[PDB]
RNA sequence: UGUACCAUUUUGAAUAAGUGACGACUAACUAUGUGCCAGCAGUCGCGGUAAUACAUAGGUCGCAAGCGUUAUCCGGAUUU
RNA sequence: UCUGAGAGUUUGAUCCUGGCUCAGGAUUAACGCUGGCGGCAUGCCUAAUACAUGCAAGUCGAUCGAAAGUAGUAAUACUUUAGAGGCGAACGGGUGAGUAACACGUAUCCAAUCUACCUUAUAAUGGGGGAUAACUAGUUGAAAGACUAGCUAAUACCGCAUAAGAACUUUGGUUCGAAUCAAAGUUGAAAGGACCUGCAAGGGUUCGUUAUUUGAUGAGGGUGCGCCAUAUCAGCUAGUUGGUGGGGUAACGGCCUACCAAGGCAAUGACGUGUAGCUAUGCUGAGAAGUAGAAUAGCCACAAUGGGACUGAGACACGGCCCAUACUCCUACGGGAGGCAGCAGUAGGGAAUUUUUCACAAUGAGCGAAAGCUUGAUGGAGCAAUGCCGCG
């Protein structure tokens, strides 16, 4: 797995299941009609690899895939670990 | 081919209540004698008996049998 | 046998659901019913998706019977139920699908309309 | 062909059998009036060999008009 | 009615048996490489499975997947 | 499709206009009938006694092989 | 900048907050009164109600045997194809019933899939066998049809050989779940037609076919984002969420399955209900945006409904099959044809949506080396002042 970048950084929220992770990634942008800065929250589901396993609290990098299983669809690429 | 001599036409003169749509059916039935598409045993015997005149003379009235 | 205020399924295409006997058509006091007699009925339950209304009486035929009748051939046919098929005012039927069989007890009797819509005969 | 009646107007296109009349179109051609006696057909027959050369080949009604550019001449030869 | 549409029924009743038969001569090697997982059966079915993909009866996409499966056992032999 | 179109081809003003409205809003009015009766009408609002508000005649105004008429949508309405 | 108009209406009279009507453009408009034409577009939003009839996908004899007939002593020449087989049929055609979410609009990732014929060149088109319609005979038969036994050819079917090239496995090597390459193990391709030349042998032109191999192309799958109302709808969800193994559609994937589990979504409003084709686009104002999503162009889906499978490269298939369901029609009553949201046209509805139209002339499509066949796709004509321009 080596395809191009795609960014989706954001705020693990849960690791419950086993190397399977509930992210949290919020984005702000501005209003179509008015250019306020409002907030959204978009969960993901993404699968720890072996080789980097995911801790709640910490910022990732989340990529593209082939679906692992239903609605996972995505991979942890990079992790900025506990801090 | 078919010649100008072989279209003839046949016209029943008489009034109702003479046998005469029993007699017009008798003679399209056995003429109209076809035994592959059906007719047989629909056209048999068709009943222009007067128990009810109308429904018969209206169902039966047209232009011209061939 | 089947006798008067005896709910029975409907066997074409009316609506009801079941359907009681009220009078055997014919002379008095008979009050025996047999295949192929000619009763008064009422309707005991019919969506309205159909073509009958509850509550109305009409006439019908009974075809199916649980009680069973020997034909003259000396064999006897039965069934597990009861079917009767209304009928319009005459000899034509008000349905036009049948569901089951029928017999041949009321061939010679007429009632061909209704065989022309049934799958088999006995 | 499209516009007001009385009036034949085809704009020239790359055509791929399977797709309908005057529908989405891969690639237009040019522009060509068959009633105006003079040719005027905006082609830059650069591009028009690449479709020739990745296949799906449009309307044989403009070959001729593709022979008398001398299209074919160099095509054939660009073959070999 | 449509004379093609019928032309093209009976001829696919034609192929429709033939093509279950074929289907039915690949699933029944396939059991004897279940039962005996060795190379001769191996090699029978992956002929079946060429014989079906020249005619085009199995997609070489589902050829390749089947026989990966038998020859990922075969492997573990 | 003998179509379109063209050529002093021939005769010929001859072969073809109705529509809404005039108290004001919003350019375009006078006569007869009329008695809260008729009726007008998008609003203000008109008519139970000389009605430029109604019905008709005439006049006048504006459109036009179309005119009005309603439904419905944006503007005015920044009246979310 | 693109580009800006107001008036009247409350009161004895005055002002202010607000409302209402008028002043103007447009229709998938129609009614009422009249009524010339040319140019051009448009002409069921209601009953995706039921609908008689003709068309709406047919084609291939240079694929095959054979069948029939016009000439010919026969041979053979001449005309057609009933069938098999091949291509085509999934596209065009039409609607918006249903669909509130990757359906739609858009960018990537497909190290997740394929694509006959078109484009790329290369290995080859080797040798055999068996039936089979067509045809005849018998039976069930009114026919419709169905059953039984012989007769026949193929670019139809089925073994074997060659298979550079390909798939599969193994040894080595490249690179950040996959890449290119050396050797080895294993596996599997067919058919000749037509024409010309040559005494023959043989050779040649094209087509048909297999393998390999380049694009293009269509489809499918995942993706962020935005893309109706609705809180007088607070919990929703059980292959659901996730993992191991296996199977499975082009693929990855509880897609499905064997086992283990307990979470997932969720007051940044899910779930529920009503409505709904969407987009580019049509109109309005200068605009914020609203309006309508006629036609059109693309995307989306069903084709009276609910399902299922097959052929095919692609269909769950406008006029394919089967099953269940509502009806018509015929029946000799044993059983059968089935489904005009294709062009029309009619019953009814409404204000209303039309010839029961020509030709495929042209484009296209489908097919065939071909003369070319079909085409109610497509282009014209007809009716209607529905609308615009010009014109008396």
């Known amino acids: 797995k080596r395809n191009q970048r795609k960014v989706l950084i954001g705020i693990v929220k849960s690791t419950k299941n086993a190397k399977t992770a509930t992210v949290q990634v919020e984005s702000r942008f501005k209003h179509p009609l008015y250019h306020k800065s409002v907030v959204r929250h978009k969960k993901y589901q993404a699968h720890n690899e072996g080789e980097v396993l995911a801790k709640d609290g910490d910022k990732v990098q989340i990529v593209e895939t082939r679906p692992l299983s239903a609605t996972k669809r995505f991979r942890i690429a990079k992790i900025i670990e506990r801090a | 081919t078919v010649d100008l001599i072989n279209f003839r036409n046949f016209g029943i003169m008489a009034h109702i209540d003479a046998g005469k749509t029993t007699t017009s059916e008798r003679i399209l039935f056995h003429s109209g004698r076809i035994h592959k598409i059906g007719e047989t045993h629909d056209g048999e015997s068709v009943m222009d008996w007067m128990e009810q005149e109308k429904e018969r003379g209206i169902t039966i009235t047209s232009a011209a049998t061939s | 046998m089947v006798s008067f205020m005896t709910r029975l399924n409907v066997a074409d295409n009316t609506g009801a659901k079941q359907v009681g006997i009220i009078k055997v058509l014919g002379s008095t006091r008979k009050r025996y019913a047999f295949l192929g007699d000619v009763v008064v009925v009422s309707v005991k339950d019919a969506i309205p998706s159909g073509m009958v209304k509850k509550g109305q009486v009409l006439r019908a035929v009974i075809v199916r019977t649980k009680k069973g009748q020997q034909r003259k051939d000396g064999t006897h046919l039965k069934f597990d139920d009861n079917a009767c098929v209304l009928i319009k005012e005459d000899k034509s039927p008000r349905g036009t699908r049948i569901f089951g069989p029928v017999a041949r007890e009321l061939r010679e009797r007429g009632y061909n309309k209704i065989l022309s819509l049934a799958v088999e005969v006995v | ?80 | 009615n449509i004379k093609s549409n019928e032309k093209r029924l009976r001829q696919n009743i034609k192929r429709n048996l033939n093509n279950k038969g074929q289907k039915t001569k690949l699933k029944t090697n396939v059991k004897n490489f279940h039962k005996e997982i060795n190379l001769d059966n191996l090699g029978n079915v992956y002929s079946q499975a060429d014989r079906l993909a020249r005619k085009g009866i199995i997609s070489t996409n589902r050829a390749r997947r089947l026989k990966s499966r038998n020859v990922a056992v075969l492997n573990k032999t």
């Open chain 4, 1 to 80: 062909r499209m516009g007001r009646v009385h009036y034949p107007t085809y704009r020239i296109v790359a055509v791929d059998s399977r797709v309908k009349r005057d529908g989405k179109y891969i690639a237009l051609i040019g522009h060509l009036n068959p009633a105006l006696k003079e040719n005027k057909c905006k082609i830059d027959e650069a591009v028009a060999l690449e479709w020739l050369n990745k296949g799906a080949k449009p309307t044989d009604t403009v070959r001729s008009l593709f022979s008398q550019t001398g299209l074919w001449k160099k095509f054939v030869e660009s073959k070999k």
